[PDB]
mmCIF file of C-alpha atoms and ligand atoms in Angstrom:
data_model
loop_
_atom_site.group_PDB
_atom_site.id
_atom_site.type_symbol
_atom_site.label_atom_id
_atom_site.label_comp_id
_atom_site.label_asym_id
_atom_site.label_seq_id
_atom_site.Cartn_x
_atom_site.Cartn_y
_atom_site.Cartn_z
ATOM 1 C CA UNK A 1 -62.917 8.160 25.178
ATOM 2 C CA UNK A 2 -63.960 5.189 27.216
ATOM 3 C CA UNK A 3 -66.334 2.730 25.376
ATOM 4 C CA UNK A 4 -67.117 -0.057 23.513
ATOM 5 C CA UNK A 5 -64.959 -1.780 20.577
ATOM 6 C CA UNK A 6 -66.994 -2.240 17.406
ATOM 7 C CA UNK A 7 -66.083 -2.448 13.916
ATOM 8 C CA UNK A 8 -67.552 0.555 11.073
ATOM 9 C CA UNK A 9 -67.610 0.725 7.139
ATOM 10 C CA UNK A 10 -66.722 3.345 5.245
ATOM 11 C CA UNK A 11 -64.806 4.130 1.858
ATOM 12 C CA UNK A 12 -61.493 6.141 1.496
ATOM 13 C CA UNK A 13 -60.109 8.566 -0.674
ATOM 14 C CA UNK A 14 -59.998 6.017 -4.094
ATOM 15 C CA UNK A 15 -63.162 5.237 -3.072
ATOM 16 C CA UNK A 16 -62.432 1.317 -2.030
ATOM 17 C CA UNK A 17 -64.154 0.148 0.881
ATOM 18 C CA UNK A 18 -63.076 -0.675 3.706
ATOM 19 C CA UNK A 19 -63.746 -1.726 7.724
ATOM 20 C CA UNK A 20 -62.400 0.261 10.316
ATOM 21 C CA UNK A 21 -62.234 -0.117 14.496
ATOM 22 C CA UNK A 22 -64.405 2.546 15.846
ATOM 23 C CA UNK A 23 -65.315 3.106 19.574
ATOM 24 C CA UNK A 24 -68.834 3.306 20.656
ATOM 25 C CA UNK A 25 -69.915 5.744 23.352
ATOM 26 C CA UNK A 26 -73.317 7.303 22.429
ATOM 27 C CA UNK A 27 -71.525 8.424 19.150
ATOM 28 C CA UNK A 28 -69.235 6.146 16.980
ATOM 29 C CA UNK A 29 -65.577 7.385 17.300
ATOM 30 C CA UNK A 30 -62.430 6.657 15.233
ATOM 31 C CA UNK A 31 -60.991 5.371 18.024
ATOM 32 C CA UNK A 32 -58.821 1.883 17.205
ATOM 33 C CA UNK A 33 -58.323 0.202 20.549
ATOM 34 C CA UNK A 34 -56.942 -2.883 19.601
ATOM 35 C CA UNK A 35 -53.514 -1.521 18.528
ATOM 36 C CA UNK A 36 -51.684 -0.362 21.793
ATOM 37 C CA UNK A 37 -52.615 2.280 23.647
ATOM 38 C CA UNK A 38 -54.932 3.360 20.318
ATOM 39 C CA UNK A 39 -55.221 5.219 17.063
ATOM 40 C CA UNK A 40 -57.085 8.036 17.178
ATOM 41 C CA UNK A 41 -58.462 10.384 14.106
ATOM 42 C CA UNK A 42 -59.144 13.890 14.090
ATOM 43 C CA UNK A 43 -61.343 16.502 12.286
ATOM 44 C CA UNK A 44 -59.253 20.014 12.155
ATOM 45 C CA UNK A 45 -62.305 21.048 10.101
ATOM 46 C CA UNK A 46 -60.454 23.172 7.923
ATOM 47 C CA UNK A 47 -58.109 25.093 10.535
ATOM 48 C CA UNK A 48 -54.495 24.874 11.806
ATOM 49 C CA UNK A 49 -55.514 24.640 15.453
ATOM 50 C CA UNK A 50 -54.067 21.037 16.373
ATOM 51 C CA UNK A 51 -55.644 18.107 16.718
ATOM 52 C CA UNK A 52 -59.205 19.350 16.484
ATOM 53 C CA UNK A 53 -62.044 16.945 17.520
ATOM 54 C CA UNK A 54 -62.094 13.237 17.575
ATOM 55 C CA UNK A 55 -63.857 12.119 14.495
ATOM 56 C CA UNK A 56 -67.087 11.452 16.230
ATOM 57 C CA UNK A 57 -69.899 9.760 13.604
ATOM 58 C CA UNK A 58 -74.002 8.926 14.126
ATOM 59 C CA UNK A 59 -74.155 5.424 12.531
ATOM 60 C CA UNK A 60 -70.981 3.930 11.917
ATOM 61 C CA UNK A 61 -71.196 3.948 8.409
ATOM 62 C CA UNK A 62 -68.583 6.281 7.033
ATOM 63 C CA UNK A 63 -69.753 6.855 3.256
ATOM 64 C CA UNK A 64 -69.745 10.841 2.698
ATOM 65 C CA UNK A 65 -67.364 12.105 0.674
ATOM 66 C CA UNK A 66 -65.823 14.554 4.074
ATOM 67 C CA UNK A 67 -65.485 11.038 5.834
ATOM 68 C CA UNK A 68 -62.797 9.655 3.230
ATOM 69 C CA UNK A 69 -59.670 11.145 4.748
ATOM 70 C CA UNK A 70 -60.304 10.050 8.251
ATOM 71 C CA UNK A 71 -61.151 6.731 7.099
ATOM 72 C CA UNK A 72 -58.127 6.230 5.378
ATOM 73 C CA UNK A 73 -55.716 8.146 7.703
ATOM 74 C CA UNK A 74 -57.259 5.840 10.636
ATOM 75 C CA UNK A 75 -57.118 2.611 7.993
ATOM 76 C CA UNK A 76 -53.266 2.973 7.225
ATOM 77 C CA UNK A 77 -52.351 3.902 10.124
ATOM 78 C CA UNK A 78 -53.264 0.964 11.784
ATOM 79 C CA UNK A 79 -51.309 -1.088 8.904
ATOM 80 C CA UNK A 80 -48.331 0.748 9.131
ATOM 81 C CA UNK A 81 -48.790 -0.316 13.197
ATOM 82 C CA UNK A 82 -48.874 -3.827 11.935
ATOM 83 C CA UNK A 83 -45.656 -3.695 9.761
ATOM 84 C CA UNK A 84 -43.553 -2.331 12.553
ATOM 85 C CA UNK A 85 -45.102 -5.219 14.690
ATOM 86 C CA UNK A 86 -45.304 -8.060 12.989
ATOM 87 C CA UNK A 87 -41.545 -7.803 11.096
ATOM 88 C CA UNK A 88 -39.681 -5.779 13.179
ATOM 89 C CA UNK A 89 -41.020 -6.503 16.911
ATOM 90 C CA UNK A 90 -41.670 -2.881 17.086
ATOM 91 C CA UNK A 91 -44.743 -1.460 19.713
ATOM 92 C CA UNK A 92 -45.512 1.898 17.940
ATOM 93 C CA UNK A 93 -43.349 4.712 17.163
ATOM 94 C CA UNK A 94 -41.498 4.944 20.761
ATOM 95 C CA UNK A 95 -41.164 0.984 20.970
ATOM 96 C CA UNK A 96 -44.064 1.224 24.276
ATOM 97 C CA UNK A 97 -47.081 0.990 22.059
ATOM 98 C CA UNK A 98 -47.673 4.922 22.206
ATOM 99 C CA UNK A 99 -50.771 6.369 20.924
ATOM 100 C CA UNK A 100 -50.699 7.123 17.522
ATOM 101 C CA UNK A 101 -53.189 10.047 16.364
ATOM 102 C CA UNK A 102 -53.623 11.808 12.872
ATOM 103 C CA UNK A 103 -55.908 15.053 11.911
ATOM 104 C CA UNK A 104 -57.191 15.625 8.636
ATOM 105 C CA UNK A 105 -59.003 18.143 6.873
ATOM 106 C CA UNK A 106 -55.885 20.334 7.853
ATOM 107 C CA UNK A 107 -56.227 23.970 6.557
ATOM 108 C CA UNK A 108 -57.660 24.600 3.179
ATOM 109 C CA UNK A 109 -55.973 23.438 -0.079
ATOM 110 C CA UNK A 110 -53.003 22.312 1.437
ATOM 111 C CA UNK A 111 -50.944 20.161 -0.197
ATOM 112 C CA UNK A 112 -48.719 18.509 1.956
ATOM 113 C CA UNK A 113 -48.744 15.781 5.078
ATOM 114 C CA UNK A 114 -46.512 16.003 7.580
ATOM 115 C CA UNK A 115 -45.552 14.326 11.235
ATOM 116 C CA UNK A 116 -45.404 17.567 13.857
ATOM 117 C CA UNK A 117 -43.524 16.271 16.771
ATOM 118 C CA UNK A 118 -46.502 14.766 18.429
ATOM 119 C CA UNK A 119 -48.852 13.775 15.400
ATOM 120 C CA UNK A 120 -49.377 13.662 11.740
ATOM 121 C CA UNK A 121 -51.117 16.129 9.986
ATOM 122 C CA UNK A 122 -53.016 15.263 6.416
ATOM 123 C CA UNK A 123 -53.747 18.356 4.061
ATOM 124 C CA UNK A 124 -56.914 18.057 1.725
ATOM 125 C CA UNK A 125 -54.725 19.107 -1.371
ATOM 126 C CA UNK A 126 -55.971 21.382 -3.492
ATOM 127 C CA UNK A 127 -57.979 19.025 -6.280
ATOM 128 C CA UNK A 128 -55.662 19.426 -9.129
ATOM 129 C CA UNK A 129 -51.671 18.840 -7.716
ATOM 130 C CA UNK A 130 -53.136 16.659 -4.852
ATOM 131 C CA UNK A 131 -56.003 14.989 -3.388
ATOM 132 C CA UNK A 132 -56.631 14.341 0.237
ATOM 133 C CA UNK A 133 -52.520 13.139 0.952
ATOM 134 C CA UNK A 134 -54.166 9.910 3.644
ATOM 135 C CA UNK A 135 -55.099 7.988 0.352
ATOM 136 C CA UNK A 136 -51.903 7.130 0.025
ATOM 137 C CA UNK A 137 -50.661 4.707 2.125
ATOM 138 C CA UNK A 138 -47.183 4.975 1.316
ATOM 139 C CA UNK A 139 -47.339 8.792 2.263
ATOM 140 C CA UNK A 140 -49.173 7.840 5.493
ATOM 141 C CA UNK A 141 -45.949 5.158 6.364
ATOM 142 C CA UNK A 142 -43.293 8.145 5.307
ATOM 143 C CA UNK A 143 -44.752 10.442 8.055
ATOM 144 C CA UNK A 144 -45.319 8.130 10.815
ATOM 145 C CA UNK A 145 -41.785 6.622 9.755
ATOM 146 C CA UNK A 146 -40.678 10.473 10.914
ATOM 147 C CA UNK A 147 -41.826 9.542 14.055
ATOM 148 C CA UNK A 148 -40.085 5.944 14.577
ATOM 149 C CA UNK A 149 -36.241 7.993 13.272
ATOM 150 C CA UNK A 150 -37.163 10.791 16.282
ATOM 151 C CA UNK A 151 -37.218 8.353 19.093
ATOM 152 C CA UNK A 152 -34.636 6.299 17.955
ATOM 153 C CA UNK A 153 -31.482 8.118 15.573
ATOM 154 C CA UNK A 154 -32.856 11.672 16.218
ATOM 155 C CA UNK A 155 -31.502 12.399 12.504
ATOM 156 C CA UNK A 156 -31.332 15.919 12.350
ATOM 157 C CA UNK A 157 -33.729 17.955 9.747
ATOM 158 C CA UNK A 158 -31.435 19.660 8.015
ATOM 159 C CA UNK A 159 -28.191 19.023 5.037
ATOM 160 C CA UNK A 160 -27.661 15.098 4.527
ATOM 161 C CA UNK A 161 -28.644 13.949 8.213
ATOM 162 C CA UNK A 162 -31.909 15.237 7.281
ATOM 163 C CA UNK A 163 -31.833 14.285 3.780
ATOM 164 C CA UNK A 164 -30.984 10.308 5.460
ATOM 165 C CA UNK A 165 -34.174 11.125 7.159
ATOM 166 C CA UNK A 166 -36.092 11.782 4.195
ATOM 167 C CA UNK A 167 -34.756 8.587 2.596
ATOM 168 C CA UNK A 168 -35.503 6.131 5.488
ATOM 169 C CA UNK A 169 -39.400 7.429 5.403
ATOM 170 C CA UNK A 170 -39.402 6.884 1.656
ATOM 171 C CA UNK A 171 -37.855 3.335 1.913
ATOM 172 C CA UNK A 172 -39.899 2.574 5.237
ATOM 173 C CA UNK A 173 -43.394 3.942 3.359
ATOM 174 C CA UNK A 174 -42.684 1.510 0.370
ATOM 175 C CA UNK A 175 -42.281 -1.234 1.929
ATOM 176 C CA UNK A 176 -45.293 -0.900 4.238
ATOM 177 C CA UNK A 177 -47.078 -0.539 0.500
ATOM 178 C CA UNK A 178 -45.814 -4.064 -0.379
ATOM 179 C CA UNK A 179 -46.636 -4.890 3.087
ATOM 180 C CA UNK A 180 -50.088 -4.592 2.267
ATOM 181 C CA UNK A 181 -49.760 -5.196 -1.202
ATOM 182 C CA UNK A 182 -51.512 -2.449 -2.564
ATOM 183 C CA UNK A 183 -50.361 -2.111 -6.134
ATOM 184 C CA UNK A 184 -46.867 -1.503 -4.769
ATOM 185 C CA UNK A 185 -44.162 0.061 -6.792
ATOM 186 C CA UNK A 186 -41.111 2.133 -5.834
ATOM 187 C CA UNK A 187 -42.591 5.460 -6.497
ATOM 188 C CA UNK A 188 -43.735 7.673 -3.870
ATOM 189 C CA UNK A 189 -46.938 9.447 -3.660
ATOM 190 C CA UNK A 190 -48.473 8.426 -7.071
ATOM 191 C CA UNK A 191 -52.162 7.551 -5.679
ATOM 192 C CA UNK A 192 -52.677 11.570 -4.520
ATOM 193 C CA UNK A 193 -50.707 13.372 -6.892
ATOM 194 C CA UNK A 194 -51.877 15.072 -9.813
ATOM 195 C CA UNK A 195 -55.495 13.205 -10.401
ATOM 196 C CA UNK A 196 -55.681 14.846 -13.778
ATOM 197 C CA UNK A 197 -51.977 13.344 -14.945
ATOM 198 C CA UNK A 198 -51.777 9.175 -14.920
ATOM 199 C CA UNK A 199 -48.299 7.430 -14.603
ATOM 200 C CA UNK A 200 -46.820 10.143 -12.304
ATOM 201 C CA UNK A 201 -45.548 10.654 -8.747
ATOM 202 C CA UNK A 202 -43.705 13.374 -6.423
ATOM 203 C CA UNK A 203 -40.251 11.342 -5.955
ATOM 204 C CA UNK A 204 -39.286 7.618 -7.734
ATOM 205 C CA UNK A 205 -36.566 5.328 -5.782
ATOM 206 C CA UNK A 206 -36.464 3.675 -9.031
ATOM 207 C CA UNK A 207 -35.161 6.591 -10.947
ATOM 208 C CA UNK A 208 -34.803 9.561 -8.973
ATOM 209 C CA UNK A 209 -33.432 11.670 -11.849
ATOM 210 C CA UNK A 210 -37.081 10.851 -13.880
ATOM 211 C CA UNK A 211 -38.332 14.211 -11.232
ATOM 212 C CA UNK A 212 -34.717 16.254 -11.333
ATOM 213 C CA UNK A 213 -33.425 14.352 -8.105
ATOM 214 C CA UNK A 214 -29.853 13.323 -7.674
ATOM 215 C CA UNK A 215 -29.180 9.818 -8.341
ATOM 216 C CA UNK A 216 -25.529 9.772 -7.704
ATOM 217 C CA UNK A 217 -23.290 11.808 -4.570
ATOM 218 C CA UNK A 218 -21.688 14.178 -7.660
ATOM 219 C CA UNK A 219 -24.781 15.641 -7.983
ATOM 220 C CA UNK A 220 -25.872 16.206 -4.562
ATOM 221 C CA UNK A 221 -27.734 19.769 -3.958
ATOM 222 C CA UNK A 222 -25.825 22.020 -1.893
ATOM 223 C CA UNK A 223 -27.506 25.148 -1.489
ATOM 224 C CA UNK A 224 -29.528 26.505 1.302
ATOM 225 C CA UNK A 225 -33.436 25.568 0.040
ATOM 226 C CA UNK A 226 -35.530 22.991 1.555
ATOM 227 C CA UNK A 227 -33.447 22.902 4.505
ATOM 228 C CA UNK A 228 -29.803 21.767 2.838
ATOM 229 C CA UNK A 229 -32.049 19.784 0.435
ATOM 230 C CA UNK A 230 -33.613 17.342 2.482
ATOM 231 C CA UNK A 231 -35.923 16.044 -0.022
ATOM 232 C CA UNK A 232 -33.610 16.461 -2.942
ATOM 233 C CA UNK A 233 -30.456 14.448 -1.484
ATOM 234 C CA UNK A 234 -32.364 11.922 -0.385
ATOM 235 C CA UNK A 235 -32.711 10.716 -3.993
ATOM 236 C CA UNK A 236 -29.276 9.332 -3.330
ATOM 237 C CA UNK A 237 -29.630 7.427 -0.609
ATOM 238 C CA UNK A 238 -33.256 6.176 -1.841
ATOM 239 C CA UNK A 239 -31.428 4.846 -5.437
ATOM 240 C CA UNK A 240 -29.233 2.863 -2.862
ATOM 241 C CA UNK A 241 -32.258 0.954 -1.298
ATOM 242 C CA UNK A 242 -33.560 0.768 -4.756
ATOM 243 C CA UNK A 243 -30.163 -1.122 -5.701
ATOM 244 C CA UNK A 244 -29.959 -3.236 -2.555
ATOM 245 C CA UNK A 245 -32.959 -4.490 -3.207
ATOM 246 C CA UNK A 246 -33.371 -4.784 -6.787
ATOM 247 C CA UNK A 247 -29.890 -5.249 -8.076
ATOM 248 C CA UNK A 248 -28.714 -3.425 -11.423
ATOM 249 C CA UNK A 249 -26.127 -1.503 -12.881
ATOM 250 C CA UNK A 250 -25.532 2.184 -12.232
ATOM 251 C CA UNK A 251 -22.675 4.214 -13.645
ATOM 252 C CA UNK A 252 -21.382 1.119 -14.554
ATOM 253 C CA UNK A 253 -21.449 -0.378 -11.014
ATOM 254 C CA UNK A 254 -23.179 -3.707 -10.722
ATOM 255 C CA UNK A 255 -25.095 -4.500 -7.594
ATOM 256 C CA UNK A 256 -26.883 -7.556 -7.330
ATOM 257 C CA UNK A 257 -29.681 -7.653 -5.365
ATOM 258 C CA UNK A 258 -31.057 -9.425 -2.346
ATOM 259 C CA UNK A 259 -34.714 -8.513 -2.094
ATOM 260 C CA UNK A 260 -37.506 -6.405 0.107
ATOM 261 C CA UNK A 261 -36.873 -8.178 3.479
ATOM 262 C CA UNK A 262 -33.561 -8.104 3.722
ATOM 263 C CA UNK A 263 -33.428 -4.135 2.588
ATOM 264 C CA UNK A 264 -35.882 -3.769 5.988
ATOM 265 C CA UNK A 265 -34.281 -5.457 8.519
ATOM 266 C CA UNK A 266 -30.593 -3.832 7.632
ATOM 267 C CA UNK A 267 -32.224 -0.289 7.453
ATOM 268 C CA UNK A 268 -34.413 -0.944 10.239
ATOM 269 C CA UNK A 269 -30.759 -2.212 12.513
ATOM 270 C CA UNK A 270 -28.845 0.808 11.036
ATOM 271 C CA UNK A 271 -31.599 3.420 12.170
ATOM 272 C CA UNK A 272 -32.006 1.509 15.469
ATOM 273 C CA UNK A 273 -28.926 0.663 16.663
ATOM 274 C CA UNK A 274 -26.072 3.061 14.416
ATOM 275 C CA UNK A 275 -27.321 6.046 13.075
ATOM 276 C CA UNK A 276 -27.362 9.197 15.699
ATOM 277 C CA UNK A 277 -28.927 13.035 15.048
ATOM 278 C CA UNK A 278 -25.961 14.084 13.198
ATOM 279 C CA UNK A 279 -24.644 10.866 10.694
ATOM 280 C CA UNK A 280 -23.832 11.827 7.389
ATOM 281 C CA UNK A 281 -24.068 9.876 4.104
ATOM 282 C CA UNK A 282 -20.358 8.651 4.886
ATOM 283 C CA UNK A 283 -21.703 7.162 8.587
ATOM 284 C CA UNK A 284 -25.260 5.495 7.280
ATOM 285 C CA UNK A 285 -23.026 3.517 4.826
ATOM 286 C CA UNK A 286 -20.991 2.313 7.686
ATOM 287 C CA UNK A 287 -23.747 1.934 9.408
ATOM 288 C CA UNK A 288 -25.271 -0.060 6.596
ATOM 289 C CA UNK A 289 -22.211 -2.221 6.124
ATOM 290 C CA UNK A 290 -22.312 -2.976 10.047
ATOM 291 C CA UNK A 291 -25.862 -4.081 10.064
ATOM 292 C CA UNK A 292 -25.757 -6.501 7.423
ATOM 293 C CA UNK A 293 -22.411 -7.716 9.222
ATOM 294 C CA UNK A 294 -24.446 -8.346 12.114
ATOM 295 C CA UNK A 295 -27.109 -10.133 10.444
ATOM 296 C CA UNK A 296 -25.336 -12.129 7.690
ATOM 297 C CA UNK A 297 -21.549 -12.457 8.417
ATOM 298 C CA UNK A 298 -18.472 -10.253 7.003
ATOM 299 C CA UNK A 299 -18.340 -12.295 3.742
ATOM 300 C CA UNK A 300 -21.809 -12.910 2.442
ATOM 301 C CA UNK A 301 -23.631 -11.957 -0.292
ATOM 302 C CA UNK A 302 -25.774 -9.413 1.741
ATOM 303 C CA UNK A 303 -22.465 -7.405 3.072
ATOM 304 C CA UNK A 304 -21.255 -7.038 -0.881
ATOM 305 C CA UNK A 305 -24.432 -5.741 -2.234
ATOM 306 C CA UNK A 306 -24.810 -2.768 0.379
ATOM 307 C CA UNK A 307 -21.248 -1.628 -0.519
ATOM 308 C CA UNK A 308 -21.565 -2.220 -4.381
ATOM 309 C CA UNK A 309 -24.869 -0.064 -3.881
ATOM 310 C CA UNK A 310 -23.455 2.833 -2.209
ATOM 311 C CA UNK A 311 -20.432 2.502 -4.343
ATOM 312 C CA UNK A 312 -22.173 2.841 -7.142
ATOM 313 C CA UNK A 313 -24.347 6.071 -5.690
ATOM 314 C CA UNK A 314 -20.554 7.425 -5.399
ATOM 315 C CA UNK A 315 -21.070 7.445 -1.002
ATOM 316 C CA UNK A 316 -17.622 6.192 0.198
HETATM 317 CA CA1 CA B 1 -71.996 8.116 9.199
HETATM 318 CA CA1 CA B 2 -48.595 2.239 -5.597
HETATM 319 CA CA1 CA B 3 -45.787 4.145 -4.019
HETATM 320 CA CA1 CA B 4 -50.906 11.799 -11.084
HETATM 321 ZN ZN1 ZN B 5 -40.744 13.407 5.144
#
């Protein structure tokens, strides 16, 4: 809608509070002009019918407990914007500052988030496996990170190009958490999951096999559930990143590491420049390898770790 730029209050899911860019016309809208062409939040009101109605509120002030999602769908979204922007010179999900919009209060008891094609999507969760999934900014930066691998790789959904696709959300929503430095960790989910069960999460970089997730290429899934096991594999690829990063030993291989900021900008080049809708594990280490060839010369340290990491994740 066409109005005037203000700034609202509210509190989010964890019930921190934060300021938001609304749009004024008559009624306050979450409408976030200052990022690109906008970010735009909106009520499905408890149905599947897609987007629903721009969050539209009297007073600014966004305090009820149905207002948490929205703020915090509309908050993170315009930090994941940010990251993209400020460290990789990235304009939105397309690279041309597209509009970025997000409705929650999806359905009833539904426990999942998810980027459609043309939006994401935020489930309520049912109060005891999940709460409202926008709280979590981590899971907001995985699904919008879904949109940045469509317009660029195109990575299949399906067997290990989808299961790369997976990964690259997980790695891309944890480091927009340290990006904003949110008690950051390299879990993924553990703000909205289980509320009645402290210490846990849906998937762990860290330690995949913690949940019953592959940690090394021996154990990769290859059945037919979850499409080829796109959330299952990508425990592989997401110990890698945790390697790269971190350093360790795994299996006996040794990988030191070089850090958060270097792990983005060779992922970031691989998905960008390398990686097309059907590489498999074998092609995103080549891909991986190529990037941080690019960046920091055949022979440094940088080059080393990424192939100590996937060597020791058993991806040749
Ligand atoms: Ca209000
Ligand atoms: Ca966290
Ligand atoms: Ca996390
Ligand atoms: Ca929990
Ligand atoms: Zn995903």
């Amino acid at each position: 809608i066409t109005g005037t730029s203000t700034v609202g209050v509210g509190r989010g899911v964890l019930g921190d509070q934060k300021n938001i860019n609304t749009t004024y016309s008559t009624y306050y809208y979450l409408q976030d002009n200052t990022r690109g062409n906008g970010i735009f939040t909106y009520d499905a009101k408890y149905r599947t019918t897609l987007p629903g109605s721009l969050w539209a509120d009297a007073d600014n002030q966004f305090f009820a407990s149905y207002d948490a999602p929205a703020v915090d769908a509309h908050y993170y979204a315009g930090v994941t914007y940010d990251y993209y922007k400020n460290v990789h010179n990235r304009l939105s999900y397309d690279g041309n500052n597209a509009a970025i919009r997000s409705s929650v209060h999806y359905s009833q008891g539904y426990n999942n988030a998810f980027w459609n094609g043309s939006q994401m999507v935020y489930g309520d969760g049912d109060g005891q496996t999940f709460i409202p999934l926008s709280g979590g900014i981590d899971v907001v930066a995985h699904e919008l990170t879904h949109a940045v691998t469509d317009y660029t790789a195109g990575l299949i959904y399906q067997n290990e190009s989808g299961a790369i696709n997976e990964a690259i959300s997980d790695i891309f929503g944890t480091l927009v958490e340290f990006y904003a430095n949110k008690n950051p960790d390299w879990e993924i989910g553990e703000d909205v999951y289980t509320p009645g069960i402290s210490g846990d999460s849906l998937r762990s970089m860290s330690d995949p096999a913690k949940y019953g997730d592959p940690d090394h290429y021996s154990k990769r899934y290859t059945g037919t559930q979850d499409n080829g096991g796109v959330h299952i594999n990508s425990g592989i690829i997401n110990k890698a990143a945790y390697l790269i990063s971190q350093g360790g030993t795994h299996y006996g291989v040794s990988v030191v590491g070089i850090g958060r900021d270097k792990l983005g900008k060779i992922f970031y080049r691989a998905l960008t420049q390398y990686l097309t809708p059907t590489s498999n594990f074998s092609q995103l280490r080549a891909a991986a390898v190529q990037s941080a060839t690019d960046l920091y010369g055949s022979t440094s340290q940088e080059v080393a770790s990424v192939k100590q990491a996937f060597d020791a994740v058993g991806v040749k």
